[PDB]
Amino acid sequence: MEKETGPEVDDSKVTYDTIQSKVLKAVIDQAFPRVKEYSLNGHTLPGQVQQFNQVFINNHRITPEVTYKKINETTAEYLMKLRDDAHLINAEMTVRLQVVDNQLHFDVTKIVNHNQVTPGQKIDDESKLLSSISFLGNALVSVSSDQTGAKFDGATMSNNTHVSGDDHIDVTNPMKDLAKGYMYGFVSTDKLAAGVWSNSQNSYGGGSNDWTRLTAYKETVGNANYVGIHSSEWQWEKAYKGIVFPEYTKELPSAKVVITEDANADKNVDWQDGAIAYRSIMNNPQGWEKVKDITAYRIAMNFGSQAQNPFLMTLDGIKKINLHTDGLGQGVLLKGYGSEGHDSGHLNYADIGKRIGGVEDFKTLIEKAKKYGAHLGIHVNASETYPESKYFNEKILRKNPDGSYSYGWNWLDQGINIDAAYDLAHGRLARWEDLKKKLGDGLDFIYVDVWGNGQSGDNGAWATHVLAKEINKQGWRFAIQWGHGGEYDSTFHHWAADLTYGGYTNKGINSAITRFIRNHQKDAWVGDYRSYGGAANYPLLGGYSMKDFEGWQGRSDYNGYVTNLFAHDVMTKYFQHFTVSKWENGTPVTMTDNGSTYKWTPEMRVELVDADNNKVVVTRKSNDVNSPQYRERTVTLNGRVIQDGSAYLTPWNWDANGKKLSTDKEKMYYFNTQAGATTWTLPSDWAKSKVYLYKLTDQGKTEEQELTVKDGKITLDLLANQPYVLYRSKQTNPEMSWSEGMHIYDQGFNSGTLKHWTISGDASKAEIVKSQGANDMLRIQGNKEKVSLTQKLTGLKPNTKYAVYVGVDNRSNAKASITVNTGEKEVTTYTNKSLALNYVKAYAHNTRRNNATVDDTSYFQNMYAFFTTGADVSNVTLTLSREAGDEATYFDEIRTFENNSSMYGDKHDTGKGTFKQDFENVAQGIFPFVVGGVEGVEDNRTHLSEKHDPYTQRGWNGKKVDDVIEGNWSLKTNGLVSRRNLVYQTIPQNFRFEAGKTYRVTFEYEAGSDNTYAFVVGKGEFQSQASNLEMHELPNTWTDSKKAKKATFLVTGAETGDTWVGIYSTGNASNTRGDSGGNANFRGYNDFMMDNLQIEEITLTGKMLT
Ligand SMILES: CC(=O)N[C@@H]1[C@@H](O[C@@H]2O[C@H](CO)[C@H](O)[C@H](O)[C@H]2O)[C@@H](O)[C@@H](CO)O[C@@H]1O
Ligand SMILES: [Ca+2]
Ligand SMILES: [Ca+2]
Ligand SMILES: [Ca+2]
Ligand SMILES: [Mn+2]
């Protein structure tokens, strides 16, 4: 390429003025808000050196009519009249340029559109809107190839671990052309660096073209090439289908430049100095301050009406983690906080799940969690909904160009995507407001799932900023699913934080420039996941690694959760307590993974600092990618080694909420992924102190040991993959008030003792034991007389109807019971040997081997008693008992909660009399049934369906069957046809068909096809050696009927006491009647619904005999 030339600059017709602070002077054109040049400490950076007195309004070129006024020494103002009759533009905008110390601020302070526009109302011609304002062509700052050290550095979005989003371009003549959008951009000489911020929500496309709030352009002027950074175009008045968006969607255009000399004392001026200075002018995502202290993120899941994780139970998990981490901060995403759980009832944000304890228990959870530094978030959806939801309406649904529905997720029900632009234009904001009104204060984050994938249409930068602003206005922090989503406002990205998702192309933001700037403000980065290579092969700053134990994707591994916190997250979060100050790359390495051999340039040393001038230096141990030392670092704090390779001994000076600790509470954490002794130099304020070591378990600080300090050093030779904490004085573990608000002490057997129970019988026969998943449970075995454990149920309301259950897995034939005595009445329920395996994937005691009870299985099922308090609640007792037997019964999770069912002879309490289930007041699950093994351990596709006429009922969009038969609720199974397996069954603890007694079982049902589902009678444990079943295939209910059909069956209890009834998915093919895809799922061909179950003990007389 040959040396380039362009027009020189003739400014004979230009009048300049100057504005200046004490440190920065800007030469500005009086004709147009353009900075020609900046001066700071005798050094200069050009701005826009060639006049370009045009703007683009609604993508039309306009020569503005400008009047100028210098307001004060630092500030000038321009009134800019905009007229283009042919394109219906008639407007004016006021712009101010203002110097603030070493910053230049560009603000559009006022916009007047002379066309009549009313936010929220119809507009007959959208071209009358003033929708976009572009000052492209006027660089806010630049650098010339004639200047020494001229360079440009910019970041674009990349989520591919192999591909950096950053460009580093020497500004030379000649050079390659440049006309490209960027998220962050810096120009620098060897004397000055500048960074540019804009609130522009411009996009030039997806991927690396998105979030492009800046545009960099090469311009040749005389004999020099300039690279300038421009703000990308801004948005203003916008509409959807002629309906103008609300006023809050309009944000006045703003951009800033900051100019700096050396800012990290390395005696070089480059983009890193610009990036440090940039933190003073940049947007900061709301709630970012919290991020550095949220060390323990995880999901607590509810799903399908099951109430796997009641709000008050999550508080006990928080307490376990508080103990085990010695008071690290936590963030629990409640996936299923609403409606019947996860993926139920979307859009009705205020519909807080009733079966998990409703708004009352959610408020208690939020309030009580504060002292443990545990922040709650909720999973919501702004992209699709289901007929059941209050907000399902034809008007909100997304339709394809051909008129068909844009079908969304199908799982419990078939959802339809919504049109998010329509939604914004029609009151979306009020749904968030309703949630805030109901829930009140203290919720931390809203996690918006899906958004960013286009299901609901445009989910790009502008639309996401609007959505985030609605959420932030309620006081909530914004979080999203995708690595590329919400770059401007998000503080957490599930696909960045869960390293296992999506593979190497779908992870966090692969940009050193971006991470340098924002590492401390969000979990949005590339974490350590060696099999993805590139940036993910041992990032020096770590990167959040999220695991779970409360049911998300069937995750139950508590111990693995805690070890992962210490293996990845403690040091990740430690670094977020500082800001990056220096970043040094090494030489390129060659890697091979994921089907490619590629070059990657790794970071070798990163320095960070805090406001107290602490200095942290993180160094990769080798640049050799085939050496084990490539995946090792040293970390020093003010020169003192706190990590080397597999081990760290790290100070931690912040409480769970991030507040500075008192001197006597300052501590150090030790963790080593390998066996072996390590030696550490203590800091001066520890070196002459006594030092105590504690092993951290789910019981808190254990195995106190005073350490020997020699020559101001300690040596630690402790268990691998095990957290320890050190203090300078003896520490104890606090009272945890286990299960507060749940009416019983320690419902999950987490407190390491049974002393709060009154035990009747031989106490040696009752012990707390660990399941195969390390879940603590009460075990009773080997007892020759009854053993009982009793507590008072405390804090109950007088004259109130309640349910209580205990999870029970009984391996003995002996009677295992739950008994409530209210002071005025006693009720009891029992099980002999359990006969139904647990198939609820989000439930901690499902039958997956790694959270099995014992012998690789789990038969846990909730065993209920229903009772009513009298006038006095000072002596209500709960007793768990086990009659004589050799084998074990396991109990866990005692939940006592208000419930208004009337199942027993039309009365609430456990008692005699006809059994009826109208599904209108179910405590949880699908009682008296429990989900069967049709889908194995699954987020089971059977749940309680909720009525929303007409959408859930026959006739809407051709629906063949009602989701709900009578009242507001039925028992629905979605599409589980042709499976040859049991969908659900009664179990004797829920309903016992007594030996030799005969019952009439009646229910009403919908079935979308003939003989796809069958009513079945079984006994004992079902085996799919397949079990004998009495089989009654059921006809469809709509081809020859306008409503649900009634079915009636006689069932005699087997002498073994283990008879049950259920619904079975046959081997027959269903019939979708020529429909396919979403229509076929929606319309219910493959569905089964039950309601109005009745089971009545009868004596066979007269014609019953036939
Ligand atoms: C990975 C993730 O968050 N995916 C979302 C889906 O989540 C799935 O939800 C179903 C139940 O509906 C089940 O629990 C799966 O295990 C879980 O991965 C789902 O919420 C959809 C809804 O459109 O969004 C994501 O794909
Ligand atoms: Ca520097
Ligand atoms: Ca437990
Ligand atoms: Ca009903
Ligand atoms: Mn439903």
XYZ file of all heavy atoms in Angstrom, residues 709-748:
324
model
N 3.531 -20.368 64.926
C 4.110 -19.380 64.008
C 5.627 -19.423 64.196
O 6.110 -19.230 65.322
C 3.573 -17.960 64.290
C 4.207 -16.932 63.350
C 2.045 -17.913 64.184
N 6.363 -19.701 63.118
C 7.831 -19.688 63.142
C 8.378 -18.677 62.131
O 8.054 -18.752 60.946
C 8.400 -21.076 62.832
C 9.915 -21.149 63.044
C 10.457 -22.563 63.026
C 10.959 -22.956 61.643
N 11.719 -24.239 61.677
N 9.200 -17.732 62.598
C 9.809 -16.716 61.712
C 8.718 -15.964 60.928
O 8.899 -15.661 59.740
C 10.803 -17.355 60.720
C 11.893 -18.182 61.399
O 12.310 -17.842 62.530
O 12.346 -19.180 60.787
N 7.589 -15.693 61.589
C 6.455 -14.997 60.969
C 5.753 -15.794 59.869
O 4.981 -15.218 59.088
N 6.033 -17.100 59.797
C 5.388 -18.021 58.843
C 4.546 -19.120 59.516
O 4.761 -19.447 60.692
C 6.421 -18.692 57.937
C 7.295 -17.701 57.174
C 8.181 -18.399 56.157
C 9.086 -17.364 55.504
N 10.136 -18.000 54.667
N 3.587 -19.669 58.759
C 2.850 -20.874 59.147
C 2.916 -21.894 58.050
O 3.103 -21.560 56.872
C 1.378 -20.604 59.518
C 0.607 -19.958 58.330
C 1.302 -19.737 60.758
C -0.880 -19.794 58.610
N 2.800 -23.159 58.441
C 2.801 -24.256 57.522
C 1.514 -25.055 57.698
O 1.136 -25.412 58.823
C 4.032 -25.166 57.718
O 5.207 -24.399 57.418
C 3.990 -26.356 56.784
N 0.844 -25.323 56.579
C -0.461 -25.982 56.614
C -0.395 -27.245 55.792
O -0.024 -27.241 54.610
C -1.562 -25.033 56.088
C -1.781 -23.699 56.800
C -2.696 -22.785 55.980
C -2.319 -23.864 58.239
N -0.757 -28.351 56.421
C -0.728 -29.640 55.759
C -2.053 -30.325 56.048
O -2.179 -31.093 57.009
C 0.433 -30.478 56.327
C 0.718 -31.702 55.510
O -0.003 -31.994 54.544
O 1.703 -32.406 55.817
N -3.039 -30.030 55.205
C -4.434 -30.281 55.519
C -5.092 -31.059 54.391
O -4.447 -31.398 53.391
C -5.114 -28.932 55.759
C -4.629 -28.134 56.974
C -5.151 -26.703 57.002
C -4.988 -28.867 58.269
N -6.377 -31.381 54.544
C -7.076 -32.166 53.544
C -7.271 -31.356 52.237
O -7.561 -30.161 52.299
C -8.441 -32.580 54.092
C -8.488 -33.455 55.361
C -9.909 -33.462 55.926
C -8.014 -34.878 55.042
N -7.133 -32.030 51.096
C -7.362 -31.448 49.764
C -8.847 -31.159 49.607
O -9.687 -31.879 50.183
C -6.925 -32.430 48.690
N -9.167 -30.117 48.838
C -10.578 -29.812 48.505
C -11.459 -29.630 49.723
O -12.647 -29.978 49.726
C -11.130 -30.856 47.545
C -10.393 -30.841 46.236
O -10.213 -29.775 45.618
N -9.909 -32.005 45.825
N -10.872 -29.029 50.748
C -11.547 -28.804 52.005
C -11.297 -27.386 52.498
O -10.144 -27.000 52.733
C -11.039 -29.843 53.046
C -11.483 -29.564 54.467
C -13.002 -29.623 54.651
O -13.641 -30.598 54.274
N -13.575 -28.570 55.224
N -12.371 -26.589 52.710
C -12.153 -25.236 53.203
C -11.760 -25.165 54.674
O -12.287 -25.928 55.502
C -13.532 -24.560 53.022
C -14.512 -25.728 53.015
C -13.771 -26.814 52.284
N -10.848 -24.244 54.979
C -10.486 -23.899 56.341
C -10.509 -22.396 56.474
O -10.318 -21.672 55.481
C -9.067 -24.411 56.682
C -8.907 -25.909 56.604
C -8.673 -26.547 55.389
C -8.970 -26.704 57.766
C -8.523 -27.922 55.306
C -8.836 -28.096 57.686
C -8.598 -28.692 56.468
O -8.455 -30.071 56.361
N -10.691 -21.924 57.708
C -10.601 -20.513 58.004
C -9.683 -20.288 59.224
O -9.637 -21.134 60.137
C -12.015 -19.854 58.154
C -12.778 -20.370 59.386
C -11.934 -18.322 58.178
N -8.954 -19.172 59.200
C -8.004 -18.815 60.254
C -8.379 -17.502 60.859
O -8.762 -16.566 60.144
C -6.582 -18.718 59.666
C -5.935 -20.020 59.218
C -6.501 -20.611 57.915
C -4.440 -19.762 59.023
N -8.231 -17.397 62.183
C -8.458 -16.148 62.892
C -7.305 -15.958 63.921
O -6.623 -16.912 64.238
C -9.756 -16.235 63.688
C -11.055 -16.097 62.910
C -11.616 -17.186 62.235
C -11.745 -14.890 62.916
C -12.825 -17.052 61.548
C -12.966 -14.744 62.257
C -13.484 -15.831 61.565
O -14.717 -15.701 60.934
N -7.164 -14.742 64.431
C -6.182 -14.405 65.475
C -6.734 -14.591 66.899
O -6.007 -14.401 67.871
C -5.701 -12.964 65.293
C -4.888 -12.770 64.018
C -4.665 -11.307 63.730
N -5.894 -10.637 63.306
C -5.949 -9.405 62.816
N -4.845 -8.670 62.685
N -7.114 -8.892 62.465
N -8.017 -14.940 67.022
C -8.619 -15.251 68.331
C -9.629 -16.375 68.183
O -10.090 -16.647 67.071
C -9.255 -14.013 68.971
O -10.272 -13.433 68.159
N -9.953 -17.038 69.290
C -10.875 -18.177 69.272
C -12.266 -17.733 68.829
O -12.743 -16.668 69.225
C -10.926 -18.869 70.640
C -9.710 -19.753 70.894
C -9.794 -20.431 72.246
C -8.539 -21.263 72.488
N -8.668 -22.083 73.729
N -12.884 -18.534 67.972
C -14.213 -18.211 67.444
C -15.186 -19.331 67.800
O -14.780 -20.478 68.014
C -14.167 -18.035 65.900
C -13.219 -16.946 65.395
C -13.599 -15.548 65.812
O -14.750 -15.105 65.648
N -12.619 -14.807 66.324
N -16.478 -18.996 67.799
C -17.539 -19.986 68.024
C -18.575 -19.891 66.896
O -18.505 -18.982 66.075
C -18.266 -19.754 69.365
O -18.782 -18.423 69.386
C -17.312 -19.949 70.557
N -19.533 -20.821 66.883
C -20.595 -20.842 65.867
C -21.895 -20.318 66.483
O -22.225 -20.706 67.594
C -20.795 -22.273 65.372
C -19.562 -22.814 64.669
O -19.023 -22.169 63.776
N -19.096 -23.990 65.085
N -22.620 -19.438 65.773
C -23.816 -18.858 66.374
C -25.033 -19.809 66.333
O -25.026 -20.814 65.631
C -24.064 -17.637 65.499
C -23.592 -18.063 64.144
C -22.419 -18.974 64.384
N -26.063 -19.482 67.106
C -27.352 -20.159 67.010
C -27.940 -19.774 65.652
O -27.932 -18.585 65.286
C -28.254 -19.694 68.164
C -29.734 -20.069 68.038
C -29.977 -21.559 67.865
O -29.250 -22.355 68.517
O -30.875 -21.940 67.080
N -28.478 -20.759 64.935
C -29.006 -20.522 63.566
C -30.534 -20.358 63.486
O -31.048 -19.959 62.448
C -28.551 -21.652 62.631
C -27.043 -21.820 62.547
S -26.134 -20.304 62.218
C -26.561 -19.973 60.492
N -31.254 -20.633 64.578
C -32.727 -20.580 64.568
C -33.279 -21.371 63.384
O -34.086 -20.863 62.608
C -33.241 -19.133 64.539
O -32.836 -18.442 65.732
N -32.835 -22.614 63.264
C -33.198 -23.434 62.131
C -34.695 -23.529 61.946
O -35.425 -23.811 62.908
C -32.644 -24.839 62.294
C -31.150 -24.925 62.266
C -30.294 -25.032 63.350
C -30.334 -24.936 61.099
N -28.993 -25.125 62.906
C -28.990 -25.055 61.529
C -30.609 -24.848 59.717
C -27.907 -25.104 60.614
C -29.539 -24.885 58.816
C -28.199 -25.012 59.278
N -35.135 -23.296 60.706
C -36.533 -23.428 60.280
C -37.449 -22.381 60.895
O -38.648 -22.600 61.023
C -37.084 -24.839 60.558
O -36.101 -25.762 60.176
N -36.890 -21.231 61.258
C -37.724 -20.171 61.814
C -38.885 -19.838 60.882
O -38.749 -19.769 59.640
C -36.896 -18.929 62.179
C -36.246 -18.231 61.008
C -35.338 -17.102 61.498
O -35.766 -16.326 62.377
O -34.204 -17.006 61.025
N -40.057 -19.694 61.476
C -41.251 -19.384 60.693
C -41.993 -20.627 60.220
O -43.110 -20.520 59.706
N -41.373 -21.802 60.343
C -41.995 -23.056 59.869
C -42.657 -23.867 60.977
O -43.074 -25.027 60.761
C -40.955 -23.923 59.146
C -40.221 -23.152 58.053
S -39.164 -24.249 57.046
C -40.382 -25.260 56.245
N -42.743 -23.267 62.159
C -43.501 -23.879 63.290
C -42.815 -25.069 63.971
O -43.390 -25.690 64.890
C -44.921 -24.291 62.847
C -45.659 -23.215 62.119
N -46.026 -22.028 62.710
C -46.058 -23.133 60.828
C -46.640 -21.268 61.819
N -46.660 -21.911 60.666
N -41.609 -25.418 63.520
C -40.861 -26.523 64.129
C -39.371 -26.168 64.067
O -38.961 -25.334 63.254
C -41.186 -27.861 63.427
C -40.923 -29.054 64.364
C -40.466 -27.987 62.059
C -41.515 -30.362 63.860
N -38.570 -26.743 64.947
C -37.139 -26.425 64.930
C -36.417 -27.452 64.076
O -36.559 -28.665 64.286
C -36.568 -26.409 66.356
C -35.162 -25.902 66.390
C -34.900 -24.529 66.528
C -34.078 -26.798 66.285
C -33.574 -24.051 66.567
C -32.756 -26.328 66.316
C -32.529 -24.963 66.448
O -31.229 -24.521 66.513
N -35.673 -26.965 63.081
C -34.784 -27.827 62.256
C -35.509 -28.934 61.491
O -35.241 -30.118 61.683
C -33.630 -28.406 63.111
C -32.522 -29.004 62.258
O -32.405 -28.628 61.057
O -31.783 -29.893 62.771
N -36.390 -28.522 60.583
C -37.212 -29.437 59.787
C -36.430 -30.332 58.831
O -36.937 -31.356 58.396
C -38.239 -28.600 58.987
C -37.621 -27.484 58.103
C -37.023 -27.959 56.766
O -37.562 -28.872 56.172
N -35.877 -27.348 56.298
N -35.187 -29.957 58.525
C -34.383 -30.690 57.540
C -33.203 -31.434 58.161
O -32.372 -31.990 57.437
